[model samples]
Target: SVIKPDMKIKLRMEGAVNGHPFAIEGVGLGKPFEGKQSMDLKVKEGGPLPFAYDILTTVFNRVFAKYPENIVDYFKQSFPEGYSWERSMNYEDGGICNATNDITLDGDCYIYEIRFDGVNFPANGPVMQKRTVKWEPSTEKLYVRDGVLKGDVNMALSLEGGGHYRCDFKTTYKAKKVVQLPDYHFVDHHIEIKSHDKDYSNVNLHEHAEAHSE
Candidate 1:
């Protein structure tokens, strides 16, 4: 039996194994850990389903949000030297980017550029892969290309084992451009892309947690 065009593809990266929401070194605080669960579906047919995208985006959101329903937050106990927490959601992407949006979706090319507002350290505390890194594209390289953090980076995405969806993310953080190095805290931006149809019709998870857009 072979996978067909009608069959939907999927991939996953266990938590912490994926990337970091906010890279907090010591900052006098909680557990220092990371995890992830991601996948790449060929979708040679079917359509771009929100279900798949949500899997990763929502995971990223939940991890970042650090709620109970979400993964276990390691940085909940202590913070940096002068940082505070402001827990809020986009509210527009679909209530929680949980695959519940009425607006339209154009899932073709997207890169989430993010940062945080780590003013000081809980008085104190907080926190894309690229198409290519260094001088190589075949070999996954890492470097700072664009970011609010130190290594707002440029990494390459490849089929990590027959993975159809190739992705290179900007993970691990450093504070070079910004004062905080790797963004103990800040904000972020997502490069939203649309499919050729940009219809995202077959792509079920049409709705996302809306962005109140403050």
Candidate 2:
């Protein structure tokens, strides 16, 4: 039950944002899903905080897509010690940040855990403003047995300007089939973004940014 480099995974995301539902389904090689294939949202309402969907889509493309193999390579370079690591950053302007990373192998699955905390003081001269961000310990598991990957994320941010944002979502990827080819060749590489009454498909992963940029 191993994932070859050329394996194709059928990725599907079904979750809710502030009680509003959304879903993304697609197929891709190596990654969980292609950007164009699943950018569209199947929803009824305008959806609460379109930015939330944007953030989730971006994370799926950047992190979840790379699953066990690619992410393992990244961890080897970043956390050479292997099991766990911690990072802290202190800015000159009185901003402090910290993150924790951990990885474990459970039978045929590789489990990754991450958490973050940060505080920033925005320079408003006379009036001091503080922004805080927290990412509760989240879990991402990649199973080689069923060619499945799953993740849970919980995040919260409080702006210095008196606004608070929070989101909790889950995603899953299942491998429908396997291909020995070095790479996957989709019938059409470019899938046009469809227009919806509540358009949350504008979140671009930059797959074709340069060619379309004017």
Candidate 3:
């Protein structure tokens, strides 16, 4: 599908997975249609999402946001010390949930980039070749430049091994320029869905749980 300059593009995911709100939405111009797209994106909040999760949760809590000296030590060298070092972050329920890709930094250390390949689903359930969600964000402190979220992402579940059939997918956002989106302070941008108990359109389970308890 060829996307005309006049056409509109919108993609959003607002749902709960692993007992948290992993919601994010975006509106931008369209790029040429490469394939079918599904708006369903279930991001595990504490774990990795379709986008980057700072991967510095511990560092942020302990030093960067705590001790200024540690932060100075963090940036005074090539690659912020641990930024280049990849590690698996644990989940609230315990054990590793998502792992960080090898860290990459731009000149001057103004930009920090990493691939997050740690979002996963239950192995017992569902279908697909493999979720294979790959998202990389090149950032200036923490904002996505021009709203460009780069990578090849999607869920490829096939019927009769025809994985191409009825597959869910979305390509990178190709805007006219580097479109700055609102500050993503509390937004959980969804890039892929590993395995969801309910469909994205259904009412939330926690909402019902709260209602029933009350």
lDDT of 3 by residue, 138-203 (tens): 111222344443322222222333332122222232232232332322111222332344223221
Candidates in descending TM-score order: 2, 3, 1
* Order of quality (lDDT): 2, 3, 1
RMSD (Cα, Å) of candidate 1?
A: 19.8
The TM-scores of all predictions, comma-separated, are 0.20, 0.28, 0.23
Better of 1 and 2 by TM-score: 2
Model 2, range 48-78, lDDT digits (tens) per residue? 3333232332232222232222223222232
Q: Name the runs in model 1 displaced over 4 angstroms.
A: 1-30, 33-50, 53-147, 150-163, 170-214
> lDDT of all predictions, in order shown?
0.21, 0.32, 0.25
lDDT of 2 at 40: 31
Better of 1 and 2 by lDDT: 2
